[PDB]
């Protein structure tokens, strides 16, 4: 009768809040704190929201947390930690290429969900560049072993790049490339094209970044990750959200915009498994971190700076918190998976609302004296 | 004559401003201090200005100010002295059932306008979860005589809750039910649906709340207000709007927008009757004041943070100060009464206006040295 | 309780529709064609429906039809016929001004509802122009005691005209004046201050009617209705809509637009009453109607075509019938006058709707070999 | 005092109608029926409207009526008689150049306001194409001492009529040349920029033109001339609109809109003075009339139709006609002169109307058995 | 076949963005912060993008960077070291007349693109006021054989500039003129067409300016540089973008919005060939910086303050700097030229993004204890 012949069983739902595709099209750049995610419906507990992700068109992860392959981020360390947690770790390229060989075969010769190959080695990853002398880098790290290799660069839609991606998918058929970075869509069509097997998304957003201020370039991290995302689901191609990660929330929207997985290395630096050593500073515990594009880790133009970032701990104590956010957050979001999360986003049923300046202003802590946040 | 027959005696009332129709329908998310409220004409005093708010379907409250269940803000002590002011008292569970239940008798077994039932007894509320082991806490605060009960959760509209009030409206058929925390319509469809008596809006705008930037949801309050207000409006369902208050205009608007009554945490923080004991910091009286979802008050996820707020006196003092707020800023709308400024504000009478970032700068104090600002 | 502390008691009436400012402010001009009224709640039958109408601001009418001053639409005996049934009628200028005074004081020396004065003789008006010679005209009928003159001419904003309004007020002061032809807010400016007692609105929307075609000027009828109507409540002046009405759908939704009263020439042309003799042309019974700017009723150009349409019986039979048209659209509306009309428009309670072509196809009738129609 | 330091002396002028920099950028394509002229104020009778127009930057004539160089519109009794009341002519080259020739010596061998140079001969215009033949036609008309050329093509933005362009005004330095036709502003670059003295404004409207249905190209007549007008006016260059000219009001229309002449093919053909003989057709005396794309008057593919328009009488009793129209219709606007129709125009003063379809059926003849038009 | 006939070989270039058309017609006033430029395609190393920039319509410089005509910033020991990196400078005019033909001379009596003119001598520009005794200064810095003179004005649509560059235009003819400061399209009208050679865009926007906050006029800077350059762009003068520029980013963005050449004050100043000597505070090395409106550097309104700013070394290691980061930036735009960044932002094919407070955020450094930023 006439409770299911009229709209076919499914409710009313008011409709209330806009769209991904109603939000991202307004002409105006978004990034992560412009916008938060509308709640809907509960019918499951949060321990078994499941995070399985695409890393790549073949590698699968168990969480969608990868790290960067920077020289204060990653090393075998974190490319052994980072694995056992689920995740999947890249090993800079700021070395000799015997060295991060060693590296690689150090995390290769190495925990319920610990993202194993067929072999039960742990997953690594390689950055590399696009220049000629790299190509022995990628023969010295493809003898080590390695599953998959990041193409470091700032800009992704170059010929170098594309020449290199060409060179990879017939010299060595099984290894899975990452193309990056990219902002638009027209890279991403210059890139997939190429055959690339995962995008890497963001240019000028990241916390040791100035390419915004000193080469005047790049997009926000939101309305990339969406942008990219959009036109890379046509494909059957990942994406990766580098830069502009500061907290859980950050990742719970990235990840709801599209991106598979979330690269981390401020929020991953300064942890025990990252490299370097601490030192103190106006009685603060801290490591050294600097970027890539640094002069201290290179006329030469510099697109990073060199910091510090506070202690985080031990990582297999972090990354769980991680996870136990983002499974909240799907949780009030309504979806028992991230893949539940995109099919929602993109079919319209997830919405969105933007932000204004005092509405970030009441969204963190206000109207205290002072407060003492422990988040785990 | 023509004096009357043109416009049949309504006069002119030039067109100028945005209903709250036009204003939270653009899509932006606004909060309490990205607007407000156009004044109109006065004919009246400000003390003959009729405060009367409904809580429930059934509770009728002299002052629409009502007090948040939180371990550090109410116990029996404040929901006595917020109901002989006009308001009503929630009393937190982070406590033992027994305990709750022995503070529920003390403010029932113990004021011109002092909000009392039929029983010439002082009304109570108490906050209980959503969990199987809540109805033993449900069974023990209505044997000790509870009026209203909120079912005290993040995210409102899950099974679990729907279940529980399902389970409330027929064993206590006389015991009134407040739903929560609601931000969208389709959340306060499942939950009227339900039988609530009351809804509870506002999910990320606490001033001790981290959720927005951990879980990365919610919404902005004032949105939230008026897109739970408009729809609850059509099955005579008040709401109660926490979180965000900062001052006595936010309760204004936050009651010119829809909401029956206001609940504050924050602001009657650190009050004579808050529990606990102050202490020093830099020179400054001021005393401990938690959320309940961080980990001082429970993998555990915080949403919460542990600060503190400067002393405010007693609340005889303070809540007739907030009162007489509300009396003149009805005066400076020009409405007699709470229930004829949401009249106005449905009819499109009552006019709005968005506020820009630097007309928030000129809107509190600025161009002085150093200012000694007394509310009361 | 609840039921009347939410929104004041008033009930939640979905929005739905567009309201009078919402539609004639978008720029594009309507006509009456263009939209149409959407219906509300009835609680009272058609025969109680009020129809007192102002047309000045001191002359009151019964019926808010008056007839139009040309030389084959009305003479003493449509003034006393359109005087009888509630009107009034206004005597062309067409002739000398022995003959106009002749005719007015034929109607003055002459029925429940009848619009007659302190004096309880009939109320009659008369067109004069705005030259000089025509003070005479003035003089003497004046002399014959005309209760209002219109200042025919079919551009009203000239400096003739407001010197002979000023003319007027002070040689005559009770005598009241009716001022046009007006379309914009301007042209009621420079008139209103100039001491007018009525506005008389529309120009280029006649039937007989070629100065948009010819002088390439005007504006559609439904947005000069409104948009003179709208300014000239603002000072108590009633306006009178002419031009574009064919039937009783086009004077209920100028009535509905701010018109107080609504004037007719082709719609009153070849009744009984109505000056000339019949005829027949291809077997039709029909008298000639002409225009007052076409050549056979004066280098001259003319601003009029000399055509004919169809008997339509008497006026004591057809009046009655705009009557009941009436009090059924304003009912279907849901007011009880048309006072309650306007200001149900004017408050953006009563809406409207925008019409398409292919609806307008539909508004009509279609899907017929053949009809026969009799409106009454 | 107070009356004067507000706002200057000027008064208030309620803003009400659209301007044409609002009407003619909403992206959609306007004709001369889709909109109206607003009417202002009147302080000046109809005769003395000064009708002074310029037809290139040194040809000045005295009413705004050029005539079309077509072989059945004018040869020279049409360049005589367009002269004698005010206008100018243009013999079509349809014919040898012997003919062409002895056209314009006879117009130049040949009234109040008649048009005439500093040798008191009348003035006359003469069509040439582009092609290099046409080079020896512009010698044989330059020596019988033409004043101006036209160059007759449907696409005027051509590398041949450029250099025809820069072929005369070295040759020929006091020739007066006109341009055209073209409908776009970049059209009117590439020819103001040659050294253009006077722009033809109009491709695809024409009542004998099939353009738009056959080669797919064009722009509405009313939105072409506004912008070719409002970027001829950067430079001192007048424009000319042809086509779509069907009565006196699509000649105001056009000079309201930035045209300074304009110019009829079809509202002066047959005409007495135009070329050809009159025949019966259904009892109806009218005059044949094609277009010079029509294979009659040249695989080639045809721009023209081979039609007939009914009889007009003679051309010293018609142009007189529209002159008063003309006047009338500034009168109307409010304007003492074309100039000053223009100066309101682009200073946002003189403001416009967009008009619906059953708009433009109440501004012509509705509501009638059937009428007997007499302009003139 | 189809790979080549369908869209003519050009490729999908999928479409995402906003052109700068689409960005700076929106109404909203946008600096530079406001926005930036989303990257393309790389065929090319950033060592061979050219930098070839037009100063006026007879000047062209090797590197698009010219120096302010400030006391504190050029005076000829920057004119000679400008000018041997490639760019120009312009000696202020805060000076007797004889003391800056001395600097000028000094100058043009003193490096593999070294910007010199046909007699192997150093480019060099001083700057002049409107007034009647600086044709004085014009004619003894003339004699010393200046290529250059600015106009050197806060508002430069004066009578006086126009008289002063029409003086210029006919008794120096040979002279280019650079008139300023003009931010409107209306005062690049009035003086392209009085004959200048050069405009010089930005009122309101220096770092040591308080025009905008006292005499409440200009507008901002990079709606400014685009409204000026797409207007002068028609008659081919190129513009100066002067002030707002804070690192190599806002150079890059203001080279992308259509200025030829960018002129810097106070990223030059403190810089070893800059006037004055150093001095120190709070242990912080850096010189002396005032506006020229500054009442230190003249009832007097002052225009300008009178700061300091940090010591940057020798500017042959600075402005190689600059070089480098707009190569790297036109690298990443994908142009390898500034005429072809130019060539593309004008075609629609370079496109922009809006970006808000929190994406100005995270364009920055965030998320870092402190960071030591080393730029070369
Ligand atoms: O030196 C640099 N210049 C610009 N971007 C960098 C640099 N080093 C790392 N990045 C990017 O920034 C990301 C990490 O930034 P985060 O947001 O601070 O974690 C990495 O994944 C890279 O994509
Ligand atoms: O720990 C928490 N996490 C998130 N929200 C909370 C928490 N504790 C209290 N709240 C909410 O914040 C409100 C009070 O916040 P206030 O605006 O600071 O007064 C309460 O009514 C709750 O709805
Ligand atoms: O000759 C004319 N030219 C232009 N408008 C006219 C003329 N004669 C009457 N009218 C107007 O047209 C109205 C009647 O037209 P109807 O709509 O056909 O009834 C009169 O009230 C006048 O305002
Ligand atoms: O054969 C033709 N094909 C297309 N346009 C024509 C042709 N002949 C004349 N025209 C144009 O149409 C105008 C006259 O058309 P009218 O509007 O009917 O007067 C002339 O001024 C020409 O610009
Ligand atoms: O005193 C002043 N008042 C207002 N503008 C000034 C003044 N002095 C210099 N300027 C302008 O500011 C520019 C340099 O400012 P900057 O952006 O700080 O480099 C110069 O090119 C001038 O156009």
Same mark, same amino acid.
């Given at each position: 009768m006439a409770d299911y012949l009229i709209?076919?069983?499914? /409710? !009313?739902? @008011?409709?209330?809040?806009?769209?991904?595709q109603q939000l991202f099209n307004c002409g105006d750049g978004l990034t !992560?704190?412009? =916008?938060?995610?509308? @709640?809907?419906?509960?019918? =499951?507990t949060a321990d078994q929201v499941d995070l399985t992700s695409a890393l790549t068109k073949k590698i699968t992860l168990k969480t969608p947390l990868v790290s960067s392959p920077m020289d204060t981020v990653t090393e075998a360390g974190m490319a052994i930690a980072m694995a056992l947690t689920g995740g999947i770790g890249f090993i800079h390229h700021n070395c000799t290429p015997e060295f991060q060989a060693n590296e690689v075969r150090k995390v290769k010769k190495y925990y319920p969900l610990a993202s194993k190959d067929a072999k039960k080695q742990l997953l690594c990853g390689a950055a590399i560049g696009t220049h000629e002398d790299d190509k022995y880098r990628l023969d010295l790290l493809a003898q080590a072993g390695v599953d998959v290799v990041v193409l470091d660069s700032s800009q992704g839609n170059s010929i170098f790049q594309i020449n290199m991606i060409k060179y990879?998918?017939?010299? !060595? @058929?099984?290894?899975?490339?990452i193309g990056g970075n990219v902002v638009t869509a027209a890279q991403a069509k210059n890139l997939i094209d190429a055959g690339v097997d995962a995008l890497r998304v963001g240019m000028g /957003?990241? /916390?040791?970044?100035?390419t915004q201020e000193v080469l005047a370039c790049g997009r926000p991290q939101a309305?990339?990750? !969406?942008?990219? /995302?959009?036109?890379?689901?046509? =494909?059957?191609? @990942?994406?990766?959200?580098?830069?502009?990660i500061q907290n859980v929330g950050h990742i719970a929207k990235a990840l709801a915009l599209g991106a598979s997985t979330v690269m981390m290395g401020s929020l991953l630096a300064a942890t025990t498994e990252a490299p370097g050593e601490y030192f103190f500073s106006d009685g603060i515990r801290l490591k050294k971190y600097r970027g890539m594009g640094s002069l201290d880790a290179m006329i030469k133009v510099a697109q990073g700076v060199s910091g510090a970032v506070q202690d985080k701990g031990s990582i297999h104590k972090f990354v769980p918190y991680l996870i136990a956010g983002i499974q909240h957050s799907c949780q009030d979001i309504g979806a028992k998976s991230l893949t539940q999360v995109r099919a929602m986003m993109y079919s319209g049923e997830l919405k969105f609302e933007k932000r204004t300046s005092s509405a970030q202003v009441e969204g963190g802590v206000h109207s205290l004296h002072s407060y003492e946040k422990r988040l785990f």
């Amino acid at each position: 009768m006439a409770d299911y012949l009229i709209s076919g069983g499914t /409710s !009313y739902v @008011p409709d209330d809040g806009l769209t991904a595709q109603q939000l991202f099209n307004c002409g105006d750049g978004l990034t !992560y704190n412009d =916008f938060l995610i509308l @709640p809907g419906y509960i019918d =499951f507990t949060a321990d078994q929201v499941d995070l399985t992700s695409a890393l790549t068109k073949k590698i699968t992860l168990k969480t969608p947390l990868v790290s960067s392959p920077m020289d204060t981020v990653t090393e075998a360390g974190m490319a052994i930690a980072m694995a056992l947690t689920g995740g999947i770790g890249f090993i800079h390229h700021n070395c000799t290429p015997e060295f991060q060989a060693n590296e690689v075969r150090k995390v290769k010769k190495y925990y319920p969900l610990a993202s194993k190959d067929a072999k039960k080695q742990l997953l690594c990853g390689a950055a590399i560049g696009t220049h000629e002398d790299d190509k022995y880098r990628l023969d010295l790290l493809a003898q080590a072993g390695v599953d998959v290799v990041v193409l470091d660069s700032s800009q992704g839609n170059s010929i170098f790049q594309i020449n290199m991606i060409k060179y990879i998918k017939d010299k !060595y @058929p099984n290894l899975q490339v990452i193309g990056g970075n990219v902002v638009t869509a027209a890279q991403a069509k210059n890139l997939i094209d190429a055959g690339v097997d995962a995008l890497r998304v963001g240019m000028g /957003s990241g /916390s040791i970044c100035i390419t915004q201020e000193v080469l005047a370039c790049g997009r926000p991290q939101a309305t990339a990750v !969406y942008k990219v /995302s959009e036109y890379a689901r046509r =494909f059957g191609v @990942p994406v990766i959200a580098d830069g502009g990660i500061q907290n859980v929330g950050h990742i719970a929207k990235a990840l709801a915009l599209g991106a598979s997985t979330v690269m981390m290395g401020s929020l991953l630096a300064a942890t025990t498994e990252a490299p370097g050593e601490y030192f103190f500073s106006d009685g603060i515990r801290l490591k050294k971190y600097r970027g890539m594009g640094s002069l201290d880790a290179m006329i030469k133009v510099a697109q990073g700076v060199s910091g510090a970032v506070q202690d985080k701990g031990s990582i297999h104590k972090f990354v769980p918190y991680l996870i136990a956010g983002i499974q909240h957050s799907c949780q009030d979001i309504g979806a028992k998976s991230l893949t539940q999360v995109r099919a929602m986003m993109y079919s319209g049923e997830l919405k969105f609302e933007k932000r204004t300046s005092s509405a970030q202003v009441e969204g963190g802590v206000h109207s205290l004296h002072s407060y003492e946040k422990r988040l785990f």
